[model samples]
Target chain A: NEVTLLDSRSVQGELGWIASPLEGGWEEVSIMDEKNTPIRTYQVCNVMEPSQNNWLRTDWITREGAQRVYIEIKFTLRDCNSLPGTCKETFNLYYYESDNDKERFIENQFVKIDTIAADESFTQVDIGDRIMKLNTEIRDVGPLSKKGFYLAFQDVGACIALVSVRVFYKK
Target chain B: SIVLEPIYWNSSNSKFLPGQGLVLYPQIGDKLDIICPKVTVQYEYYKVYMVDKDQADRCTIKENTPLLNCAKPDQDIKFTIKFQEFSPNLWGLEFQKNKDYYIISTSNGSLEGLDNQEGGVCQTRAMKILMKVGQDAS
Candidate 1:
């Protein structure tokens, strides 16, 4: 295969992921899909008082001779509290490239790819309470000779609901 | 990225000498993957955290989080850590240049100590290793 697929997580179960912290992490709740069916999801762990910062990081994914990896996070920016907004809140995506197998934790070494702005926020109005207004972001991380990928997601402000994450690499 | 030769943290290896303590020389900005081989200790609850060089060899620091910890390690364990300095006045749980850094483990070892203390492997068996910032800076 010219391309390889890593774990595609819907936050259904544990998948070797390391996030901000259980105490300060996003809350796991069930919300409705556009079909009005129940779906398990990860939302803000606690109240969005005084703004907050949280992150979701994937375990390192690497291959024998792979040189790059692509990452995607599907999420929505809703209300900071009461009702869901138009996803006006901001978020950021970052990735770390490394060859060291021992490098596991966040050393503040991630290089930013781009920030998800209000304009880029989820805009659909028919999705369940706008909570299901999901935006999928895809990023191509090039030149990964070492090929160890640590993809991360960070919220700049407002409340957010994380839908799913997918990653891929080449053979 | 710099990987240290098999650290062999499990008690099987004698790398953790008694008095002198195992010392690692890593240059600033270099990343080291500290590996801990599996252990068959009956206690089954083992973890790695940093101790202060100023304190006697013990988990004398506050009940801070471990640099590395997880469920029963039935297999080998690898932790990625970098040797970088943080602004002294700013913030970070990091090692400074030319300074000494201490890290110890309480593997629920055989000679384990009492509550609130990291005994057993860390206390008597010398399960602690030191990290020294070495080499030229970028």
Candidate 2:
């Protein structure tokens, strides 16, 4: 089994004040070294709704027709704005690595990562990695032939900022 | 630098100081490095260990810790560590995240540290500020 994993491509742009501290400004998002010590922000126009589902897709093909493929994804979730009143804050949201439109697989209880209580410096983030499961969190975008698929962060709700999304696979 | 003895300096003293708990000199976004176990003696010192940020607050080192040694060169970006010189030849190894450490020394005669480890599945009590990504599509 052979799959062609894609390089991390990012879509960036400031979502129009989705939540609040109500500060009107734009957040630059981008992929960076996993450490997050360094980052290169992106300028994405037509931003994907932060409150909805988002995914990074990949493509693969069956050379000898094997059975399973494992996908590994790594990313960071940054708080665009620091805490309001006290420096300690909490932003709770559920993240899912899902496929086949299965909502329950990734729920609030299964929050992959969160940065609600963060450093005041305003650039705190979290990285995530998961194995790909068919009809599971890893969605199978029907094959017009390529043995690959797509994935998204389902319903990014209340107070979670995500950055640096990428995917890899083992066939 | 290396420290030959395990000196105790608490809140009341300054010379062989334990420091005011842990002081993050660079604070949040500071670029400089910070070390732990403030310098005291000379020659061989102890190997630095990192604890969870919460554990560091109490100035407690764990006994038989499971946390990965961040100071080791091959670690990924998830661990934060730096070296400090308490004396000209003594080094203070520190980690700001919350966790505890077991005393391991490479200096001053082989001092045996906390060898009694707890049961299975011992998670390192430290904050992971970074994530490691694997997969080379290039």
Candidate 3:
């Protein structure tokens, strides 16, 4: 398993505001099929801090004689807290797709949080929550196409956000 | 395009204009401002009335009854609807021109008719027959 950092671009936010103040963002972890046209973009996990962590994974089935697939990642942060006191505010995280575009797509089952752990210094946690594996035999695979495999995360209240993205295929 | 006639008034007989024409100028009463549009076309109207087949007019328009039957001709009738107007513009009623409406006996113990108005020109009772047959056939 080859792991790479997609969102090296560090961003900051205010304190007490849940995971800073501004809504964080994600890097487009993308992959190209035989046609070299970016067929998919999956979000990979990054900066899984005790206060904030996020990630999304997707699987893709390559045509027998395909080319190469590329992946990218970016970071996102949000100032959610609104009080004077500071606490271990776990960052809200989830996934989503490009076409069936939605922010709070699957809030019922795709979001999580950790117990309030106090720490003066910002703590980092890995959002490697779950690994979404793809099966070649599965008829439905690609996004919108209902053929290739794909993945996404959804949030609640506001719009959905894509974290890190990844996809793999063989020629 | 089945060329249907417009609703008109027959001043002499106190009936509708013969064979669809302009609703005569200076409507039945001064209470109405029915302007006779220059392009003489068909106009249709209706009154929500209860059902009583024995009457000359197909509608039993008594407020107390829940069963209202739109009147219609005794044949396989069909026509076009132009526009529908409600009395006092307060959901009172709706009438259409050139458009054929069917009156059928509903399962809700209501004899909803196609058109059933008294002393009103451009009213339809012929449509009631079509609706009855259509509902029966189905």
Alpha-carbon shift of residue B46 in model 2 (angstroms): 8.7
Candidate 2 local lDDT, A1-171, one digit each (tens)? 435343333211212112221111112222223332222221111122344233211122222233333333322222233322212122322233332332322233343333333222123222113211101122222222233233323322222223333333346
lDDT of every predicted structure (CA atoms): 0.54, 0.25, 0.24
Off by over 4 Å in 2: A1-138, A144-158, A161-171, B1-24, B29-60, B63-67, B70-138
Tens digits of per-residue lDDT, candidate 2, B1-138, equal 111122221122233213223222222111121122222322112233344444434334453232222232221211122221110000112233232332221112112322322211112222111111121122
Native contacts conserved, per model: 0.00, 0.00, 0.00
Model 3 stretches with alpha carbons more than 4 Å out: A1-74, A78-146, A156-164, A169-171, B1-138
Model 3 residue A77 CA deviation (Å) reads 2.6
Evaluate model 3: give its lDDT.
Answer: 0.24
TM-score of chain A of 2: 0.32
The residue-by-residue lDDT of candidate 1 on A1-171, one tens digit each, is 445556444333224456665424443333334443223344452333445576766666675466666666666654433432223366677888766655556737887878764333322323325333356777777676664767777754455666556676645
Which candidate has the highest TM-score of all? 1
Ranking by TM-score: 1, 2, 3
What shift in Å separates residue A7 of candidate 2 from its native position after superposition?
Answer: 16
| Top-scoring candidate (lDDT) | 1
Q: Which ten residues in a row have the lowest lDDT in candidate 1 chain A?
A: A119-128
